[PDB]
Enzyme design. Structure first.
Site, mmCIF file in Angstrom:
data_model
loop_
_atom_site.group_PDB
_atom_site.id
_atom_site.type_symbol
_atom_site.label_atom_id
_atom_site.label_comp_id
_atom_site.label_asym_id
_atom_site.label_seq_id
_atom_site.Cartn_x
_atom_site.Cartn_y
_atom_site.Cartn_z
ATOM 1 N N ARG A 1 7.646 -69.377 27.964
ATOM 2 C CA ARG A 1 8.210 -68.254 28.697
ATOM 3 C C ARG A 1 7.119 -67.489 29.445
ATOM 4 N NH1 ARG A 1 13.503 -66.645 27.036
ATOM 5 N NH2 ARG A 1 12.813 -64.459 26.920
ATOM 6 N N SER B 1 -11.201 -56.969 31.323
ATOM 7 C CA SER B 1 -9.999 -56.141 31.291
ATOM 8 C C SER B 1 -9.032 -56.634 30.221
ATOM 9 C CB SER B 1 -9.348 -55.987 32.650
ATOM 10 O OG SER B 1 -8.561 -57.119 33.002
ATOM 11 N N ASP C 1 7.373 -52.427 28.756
ATOM 12 C CA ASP C 1 8.809 -52.576 29.002
ATOM 13 C C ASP C 1 9.270 -51.427 29.904
ATOM 14 O OD1 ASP C 1 11.749 -52.553 28.796
ATOM 15 O OD2 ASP C 1 11.598 -53.530 26.807
ATOM 16 N N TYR D 1 12.039 -51.364 17.991
ATOM 17 C CA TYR D 1 11.485 -52.023 19.147
ATOM 18 C C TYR D 1 10.952 -50.985 20.135
ATOM 19 C CZ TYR D 1 11.087 -54.483 23.526
ATOM 20 O OH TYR D 1 10.628 -54.956 24.730
ATOM 21 N N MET E 1 10.181 -47.880 19.647
ATOM 22 C CA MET E 1 9.010 -47.203 19.065
ATOM 23 C C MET E 1 7.739 -48.011 19.299
ATOM 24 S SD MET E 1 10.781 -45.843 15.587
ATOM 25 C CE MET E 1 9.199 -45.316 14.916
ATOM 26 N N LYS F 1 7.168 -50.287 21.598
ATOM 27 C CA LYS F 1 6.739 -50.361 22.994
ATOM 28 C C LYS F 1 6.205 -49.018 23.496
ATOM 29 C CE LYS F 1 7.353 -54.773 24.189
ATOM 30 N NZ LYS F 1 6.179 -55.624 24.382
HETATM 31 N N1 NDP Z 1 11.821 -61.167 29.128
HETATM 32 C C1 NDP Z 1 12.150 -59.922 29.454
HETATM 33 O O1 NDP Z 1 13.201 -59.683 30.048
HETATM 34 C C2 NDP Z 1 11.306 -58.769 29.039
HETATM 35 C C3 NDP Z 1 10.072 -58.967 28.445
HETATM 36 N N2 NDP Z 1 9.305 -57.912 28.004
HETATM 37 C C4 NDP Z 1 8.007 -58.146 27.307
HETATM 38 O O2 NDP Z 1 7.360 -59.232 27.923
HETATM 39 C C5 NDP Z 1 6.614 -60.001 26.929
HETATM 40 C C6 NDP Z 1 6.980 -61.459 27.043
HETATM 41 O O3 NDP Z 1 8.419 -61.563 26.888
HETATM 42 P P1 NDP Z 1 9.127 -62.949 26.476
HETATM 43 O O4 NDP Z 1 8.348 -64.083 27.053
HETATM 44 O O5 NDP Z 1 10.597 -62.831 26.716
HETATM 45 O O6 NDP Z 1 8.845 -62.872 24.896
HETATM 46 P P2 NDP Z 1 9.428 -63.671 23.645
HETATM 47 O O7 NDP Z 1 10.472 -62.814 23.007
HETATM 48 O O8 NDP Z 1 9.794 -65.023 24.165
HETATM 49 O O9 NDP Z 1 8.151 -63.774 22.662
HETATM 50 C C7 NDP Z 1 6.885 -64.278 23.163
HETATM 51 C C8 NDP Z 1 6.140 -64.978 22.052
HETATM 52 O O10 NDP Z 1 5.802 -64.030 21.017
HETATM 53 C C9 NDP Z 1 5.380 -64.775 19.906
HETATM 54 N N3 NDP Z 1 5.620 -64.044 18.667
HETATM 55 C C10 NDP Z 1 6.806 -63.498 18.240
HETATM 56 N N4 NDP Z 1 6.735 -62.974 17.046
HETATM 57 C C11 NDP Z 1 5.437 -63.252 16.627
HETATM 58 C C12 NDP Z 1 4.741 -62.983 15.429
HETATM 59 N N5 NDP Z 1 5.270 -62.335 14.388
HETATM 60 N N6 NDP Z 1 3.461 -63.431 15.348
HETATM 61 C C13 NDP Z 1 2.905 -64.044 16.407
HETATM 62 N N7 NDP Z 1 3.453 -64.325 17.586
HETATM 63 C C14 NDP Z 1 4.744 -63.933 17.617
HETATM 64 C C15 NDP Z 1 6.156 -66.100 19.932
HETATM 65 O O11 NDP Z 1 5.223 -67.176 19.833
HETATM 66 P P3 NDP Z 1 5.616 -68.521 18.998
HETATM 67 O O12 NDP Z 1 6.669 -69.037 19.958
HETATM 68 O O13 NDP Z 1 4.309 -69.291 19.013
HETATM 69 O O14 NDP Z 1 6.176 -68.357 17.599
HETATM 70 C C16 NDP Z 1 6.903 -66.057 21.270
HETATM 71 O O15 NDP Z 1 6.867 -67.270 22.006
HETATM 72 C C17 NDP Z 1 6.927 -59.345 25.575
HETATM 73 O O16 NDP Z 1 5.870 -58.489 25.158
HETATM 74 C C18 NDP Z 1 8.208 -58.559 25.853
HETATM 75 O O17 NDP Z 1 8.461 -57.440 25.004
HETATM 76 C C19 NDP Z 1 9.709 -56.605 28.216
HETATM 77 C C20 NDP Z 1 10.863 -56.312 28.766
HETATM 78 C C21 NDP Z 1 11.789 -57.378 29.193
#
Ligand code: NDP
Ligand code: NDP
Ligand code: NDP
Ligand code: NDP
Ligand code: A1H0U
Ligand code: A1H0U
Ligand code: A1H0U
Lengths: 249, 250, 248, 250
Positions: C13, C135, C141, C154, C156, C158
């Site tokens: 993703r 950097s 979000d 969640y 909180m 962010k």
């Molecule tokens: N997509 C959207 O619409 C939006 C995204 N965001 C932010 O953008 C970022 C990317 O989003 P998106 O790609 O959808 O994210 P995902 O929800 O797909 O999570 C990204 C990755 O986080 C890893 N992860 C989850 N839990 C853990 C854990 N406990 N320990 C270690 N790694 C973990 C997973 O890796 P693994 O697969 O290796 O287990 C997962 O592939 C995030 O920070 C999200 O909050 C914000 C607002 C909206």
């Protein structure tokens, strides 16, 4: 054909750096100016020397009055007359001076500070949108608007209004594929009429490097916003302030 | 003696409720109005029946023009002429209508929406501070939805953002004189009486807290707090009174 | 020779798009994963085929626990080991699910506050301690102030990340380390959520009635790490197509 | 009967001022404390001497851990046990100390204390207050300076930002239940007992409105407002009480 951009207040300082940088990216440019005729025409000469027929100047007072709508229409019209299109509007021209609450009349202070910083942007936005690839507007905002200079109420009101415009126009123009964003400097090129001690007082407050932004560093964010790398960004204001707005009293 | 307050646009709706609540709290009041003379005088008569010589009216257009400064000075002067002092200024008067980017001229739309919402407040604040010769404050009526604006309301939105900037700038600048400057930001309050109830309901249903608009009095309650002795350290603050409306996503 | 970047949750993703784009810009990369080993390896292979020995993988759980500190140290360390430097940290990894006010709650805190806020903070510490155009980029979000119903924890987490972005920008500016954020609105929607629920979100977006691609998000990351943002720190760039401007 | 409030960290300083003012308004109070047992009992003694059976104490550590949910439930239970209802929750208790990024307690302990007291405990207490359920509200003590933070205070700043998030998220989700959730954000109020006068005056001199810190009472005044019927439409609002401090540039 190459896309075209209008930059207001583009003869000197930050507006010039924006015009230069847009030109270097492939844009034809309208260099708007008010008083700086020599430097306006000088900049166009330099750009045209690099690629012929890619720069025009356009003179206009951006003070608020009953004829400001016509002047703003004329700035946009200039771009269409010279280049047959207008892809990018950069609202950079700005009046900046104290207006304490406690030799210009108050009506003139209001007309200049609110006209240049807010009203002219709005009217230019309207004209830009009426006359309508990758279309976008970038407004030059101010990172310090919530921690303002003392005695700068009318300037601060103007820049706050410009934030409002940035959001409202982003919402309303998004259906037309026009993105609207801002770049908010902290301290960049310091005033001509400011002393060295006062300049250094400001530099020392900037966490990142204890210095002001170059004009080019501000222009870099403008370039990003108009680019194909910002196609999903609208209604955003990017601070380019080296952390200054993070620093408490 | 009794403190005095100016309230702009005080003939009807929220400004009316503010003038009433100030008066009930013990303030003498200037009721500023533009077109609503009959309502303005009716209110003045009511308040003067409650306590004699405690309420006056003052007519002015707050549209931006070359005479706006003199108008604003006169409004403040009116409070001093009537009551010998001016303790409180409430910037309530506001023009509100769409100004699409894409039957008034645009320059009229500018003068009216930026004049009423921003410039007249600035000029009133200047005249208020200049004329000071205990518990001085200004309260600006802001708008809780300015970062989530209605479509095609750019000039209105610009004016209310400018008013935020004025609130902050004047709070910093007037603090050394002991004058506090704050705002109150309604979300949905009194809707236009002629707006269809079915349209009013579209708005009411969006409000988390009770699915209803604020009353004028609920807005006035926040104004009263800000001018009160319970808010003596508060300056530069804008209190949302919006039932959580501004927290709800599209 | 070439600069190096760590990207957390980089296997899929948004984090994958960020890793690829970083790579294509010429960074060597560490692909952090928790559960997605196969995907992580697949990505590293694809990258290495492009440029030899330029991508490595790193496993860690980023749930808060007494071992999170060491995990975070390890992630940073593995970049120094693979590449002898670490120029960019991208805090992308993140947990997301409802936590109604009316998994134990403490597991939900550890996941939702741990991955979203505490691990960025620990990674930031290890990144700076072990120190050019340095950097940090945090994935925030755009909808923090207009939150989804029943997503308290969640939201909180962010908000905490915004706080970290600002605080670390201030504290690390002396070291020439920039700290910034990128705030998506609706990007790639959860695999789980209904297709009808997805379109309901798409329809709300002013700019094009569609979600951001992962690559549009990465584009902003790329800007913030570049020489074109050398004066930018403590800034959070929304990439939301205007979604956060739309009223109820 | 009289309503009841829980105030966390209420033995001293701002929390005592809130509990005192709530009590003077007619509330029964639970005085939560952690280490300050003598001061807590002394306060409850004073309040009970004013009106008998109106104040109780309740000890709890608000550091995050697997038992924090139980401790929070028990705080709320203590109010119901003593008074048979719980109308107001004031989240006041707070750990505050530096956590430098480039570098006593292990980092894991710092996280537990700073994030636990400032954010996680407020969340768990909110959950319990709502589950255990007139004029119900929660008031969180926030920090006006969270966007211009002190150097080296990342974890504290993180916790106060999470508390804003909680205030917004909880206001939204609890509005259907008639529970209002707001915040009060001091700038500089009572300076730490440990700070020297010289350093205290450095902070004082930054405040536009009076060049002085807020009194504990001034912070309590805004809390009292938010819980009062004068704020019945306010939810999700954080009122700065900072004498303009946050408006001052570097
Ligand atoms: N997509 C959207 O619409 C939006 C995204 N965001 C932010 O953008 C970022 C990317 O989003 P998106 O790609 O959808 O994210 P995902 O929800 O797909 O999570 C990204 C990755 O986080 C890893 N992860 C989850 N839990 C853990 C854990 N406990 N320990 C270690 N790694 C973990 C997973 O890796 P693994 O697969 O290796 O287990 C997962 O592939 C995030 O920070 C999200 O909050 C914000 C607002 C909206
Ligand atoms: N420099 C800094 O540190 C900061 C700058 N900014 C913003 O960035 C932008 C660029 O900054 P900077 O280069 O310093 O700006 P300047 O102060 O140098 O002004 C830019 C230009 O505005 C034009 N202008 C002024 N008044 C009028 C008028 N009445 N009608 C038409 N044009 C007018 C002038 O044109 P002419 O010379 O032709 O008369 C001038 O060269 C501005 O919007 C400013 O507010 C924000 C924060 C900090
Ligand atoms: N009601 C709501 O839902 C909301 C209100 N607000 C703000 O709250 C405040 C009070 O709201 P509300 O009572 O609905 O306001 P109204 O729309 O009823 O306007 C208040 C008064 O403004 C005066 N006014 C309008 N134009 C002018 C002008 N050119 N010169 C002088 N006075 C003028 C009018 O006076 P007259 O009748 O005498 O001509 C009018 O009665 C306003 O500032 C508004 O923006 C913010 C968000 C929502
Ligand atoms: N004073 C100021 O200038 C400012 C204050 N604020 C906020 O206002 C509120 C009141 O400030 P102030 O009165 O100075 O607060 P204090 O620093 O005095 O702390 C209040 C109470 O928090 C309790 N507390 C600390 N750690 C724990 C813990 N682990 N478990 C349970 N309780 C704990 C302590 O109770 P005990 O003594 O019983 O152990 C303490 O008395 C706080 O939320 C603060 O962050 C915000 C900005 C400025
Ligand atoms: C005190 O430093 C600032 C701080 C903010 C500034 C600013 C200068 N400028 C601003 N706008 C315009 N038009 N010119 C100048 C004067 C250079 N904003
Ligand atoms: C759509 O509901 C709103 C929403 C926002 C409003 C608003 C009405 N008003 C506003 N200002 C003024 N002056 N009058 C009115 C029309 C009552 N702001
Ligand atoms: C240095 O002035 C501040 C500035 C911010 C402060 C703060 C003090 N406090 C804060 N929280 C807690 N819990 N106690 C104290 C130390 C009194 N926030």
């Amino acid at each position: 054909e190459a896309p075209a951009a209008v930059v207001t207040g583009a003869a000197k300082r930050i507006g010039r750096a924006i015009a230069v940088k847009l030109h270097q990216t492939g844009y034809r440019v309208v260099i708007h100016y008010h008083n700086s005729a020599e430097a306006a025409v000088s900049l166009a000469d330099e750009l045209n020397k690099e690629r012929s027929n890619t720069a025009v100047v356009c003179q206009a007072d951006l003070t608020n009055s009953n004829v400001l709508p016509a002047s703003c229409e004329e700035i946009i019209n200039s771009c269409f007359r010279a280049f047959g299109r207008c892809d990018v509007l950069v609202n950079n021209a700005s009046a900046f001076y104290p207006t304490p609450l406690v030799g210009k009349t108050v009506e003139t202070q209001v007309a200049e500070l609110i006209g240049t910083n807010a009203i002219a942007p709005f009217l230019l936005t309207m004209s830009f949108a009426q006359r309508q690839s990758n279309l976008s507007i970038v407004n030059l905002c101010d990172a310090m608007v919530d921690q303002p200079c003392m005695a700068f109420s009318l300037y601060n009101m103007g820049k706050h209004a410009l934030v409002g415009l940035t959001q409202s126009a982003a919402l309303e123009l998004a259906p037309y594929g026009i993105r609207v964003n801002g770049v908010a400097p902290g301290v960049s090129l310091l005033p001509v009429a400011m002393g060295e001690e006062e300049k250094d007082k400001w530099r020392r407050k900037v966490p990142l490097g204890r210095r002001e932004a170059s004009a080019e560093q501000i222009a870099d964010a403008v370039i990003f916003l108009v680019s194909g790398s910002a196609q999903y960004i609208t209604g955003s204001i990017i601070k380019v302030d080296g952390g200054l707005s993070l620093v408490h009293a």
